[PDB]
Design a protein around this ligand. Structure first.
Ligand SMILES: Nc1nc2c(ncn2[C@@H]2O[C@H](COP(=O)(O)OP(=O)(O)NP(=O)(O)O)[C@@H](O)[C@H]2O)c(=O)[nH]1
Ligand SMILES: [Mg+2]
Length: 164
């Protein structure tokens, strides 16, 4: 099951993955160079879901590679930063990009990350929910830093993956 993480640079794609994989968080920003692969098999009672995590770069110089990264994805996790309006606005085109590559053969989750920065919120949870409904995708808010909703993010995505 190919799961691609997408979104603007510095929204916390890698940190979400690190938190899910290792229950750790690093405050120091280490930009993803193109793509990094990780594997995690989620061991549910009725199925086994070998996740192939495609951690993609949000930096502009890798943008041309994004279509190739989305190719054949079973799931797309589109991440924004709740403190960054631009990052939220850009999620429509990320989700658009997934749709024109995958049509309906993809599970899409819209993630509003960094809820630990509640003081600096620029996008409300209602705005996030609204966009998800408009774009017919799932929605969740997370904090990679605190750990909040990270396990839930991955569990909900995996639950949504079609059986066949
Ligand atoms: N407060 C807070 N900071 C976070 C959170 N998630 C990530 N960060 C911080 O935001 C910065 C970017 O995180 P990172 O995971 O590298 O983002 P990215 O989306 O992978 N960026 P890139 O596209 O360049 O790989 C880092 O300094 C990280 O510590 C979060 O939930 N809360
Ligand atoms: Mg990254």
């Amino acid at each position: 099951f190919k799961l691609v993480f997408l979104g603007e640079q510095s929204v916390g794609k890698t940190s979400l993955i690190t938190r899910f994989m290792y229950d750790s968080f690093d405050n120091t920003y280490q930009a993803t160079i193109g793509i990094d692969f990780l594997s995690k098999t989620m061991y549910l009672e009725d199925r086994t879901i070998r996740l192939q995590l495609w951690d993609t770069a949000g930096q502009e110089r890798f943008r041309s590679l994004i279509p190739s990264y989305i190719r054949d994805s079973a799931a797309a996790v589109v991440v924004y930063d709740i403190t960054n309006v631009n990052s939220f606005q850009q999620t429509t085109k990320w989700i658009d990009d997934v749709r024109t590559e995958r049509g309906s053969d993809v599970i899409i989750m819209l993630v509003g990350n960094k809820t630990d920065l509640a003081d600096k919120r620029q996008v409300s949870i209602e705005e996030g929910e609204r966009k998800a409904k408009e774009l017919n995708v799932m929605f969740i808010e997370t904090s990679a830093k605190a750990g909040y909703n990270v396990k839930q993010l991955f569990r909900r995505v995996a639950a949504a993956l079609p059986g066949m």
